[PDB]
């Protein structure tokens, strides 16, 4: 799921960068190292918006290693899975236990053991994909999955979905 969110950050500006234009490297470090990052707590930070009015209030020198550290608060957008709401995405990869579906930036995994039993993997697809009587679910096939699991080890998310019910499976 997508949101826009108000987040904060702590970045340590190593002492070399302390010239007049430090603020530049701060934002530079920000986008370059906050965009496109998974976090267990918030999700994939996608777009740092409001690139103007980001709060950069004041830095503290850490006693040893003498590097400044700043607490920057900002606004951005995040793809955040959950459990129990339908999500759409085309498959990309596949396996014998299922097929990974790439949704947003998260390659969801839907495992047949959660999908409706009528489509047991007919392994005969090349490229591998599942062939069911109602529809044949291919690699770039559109699929509507409800998410029936998630995991957030920090700086990572893997979720779990199923299409066992109606309005589900292929699209």
């Amino acid at each position: 799921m997508f949101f826009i969110k108000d987040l904060s950050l702590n970045i340590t500006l190593h002492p070399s960068f302390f010239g007049p234009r430090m603020k530049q490297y701060l934002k530079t470090k920000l986008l370059e190292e906050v965009e496109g990052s998974c976090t267990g707590k918030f999700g994939y930070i996608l777009c740092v918006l409001d690139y103007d009015n980001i709060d950069i209030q004041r830095g503290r020198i850490l006693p040893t290693d003498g590097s400044a550290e700043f607490n920057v608060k900002y606004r951005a957008v995040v793809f955040k899975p959950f459990k129990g709401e339908v999500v759409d995405g085309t498959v990309v990869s596949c396996s014998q236990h299922g097929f990974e579906v790439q949704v947003g930036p998260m390659k969801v995994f839907v495992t047949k053991h959660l999908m409706p039993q009528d489509l047991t993997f007919n392994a005969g697809s090349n490229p591998p994909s599942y062939q069911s009587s109602e529809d044949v679910i291919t690699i770039k096939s559109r699929i509507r999955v409800k998410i029936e699991g998630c995991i957030s080890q920090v700086s990572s998310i893997h979720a779990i979905g199923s299409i066992k019910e109606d309005y589900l499976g292929a699209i």
Binding site: H14, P15, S16, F18, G19, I61, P63, D65, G66, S67
Partner: protein, 83 residues
């Protein structure tokens, strides 16, 4: 928190602990090739460069002095007096 600049009540001088910690970090930073806001006239010792900047009030740091309750005043080394 954050006593306003017109209400700062603490001493306008630099305590010798402030002077020692300032020159420490400033020297430490210089020793990490932080830029230098003064003409190192032949100097190569980071502590001695720091003593030079401080004598020219060119150290871009600021002292956050905590009161016993928790609030604090902020002085910038450029405005504190050194002895």
């Amino acid at each position: 928190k954050a006593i306003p600049k017109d209400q700062r009540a603490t001493t306008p001088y630099m305590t010798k602990y402030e002077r020692a910690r300032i020159l420490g970090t400033r020297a430490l930073q210089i020793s990490m090739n932080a830029p230098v806001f003064v003409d190192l006239e032949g100097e190569t010792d980071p502590l001695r460069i720091a003593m030079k900047e401080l004598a020219e009030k060119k150290i871009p740091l600021v002292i956050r002095r905590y009161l016993p309750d928790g609030s604090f005043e902020d002085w910038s080394v450029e405005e504190l007096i050194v002895d």
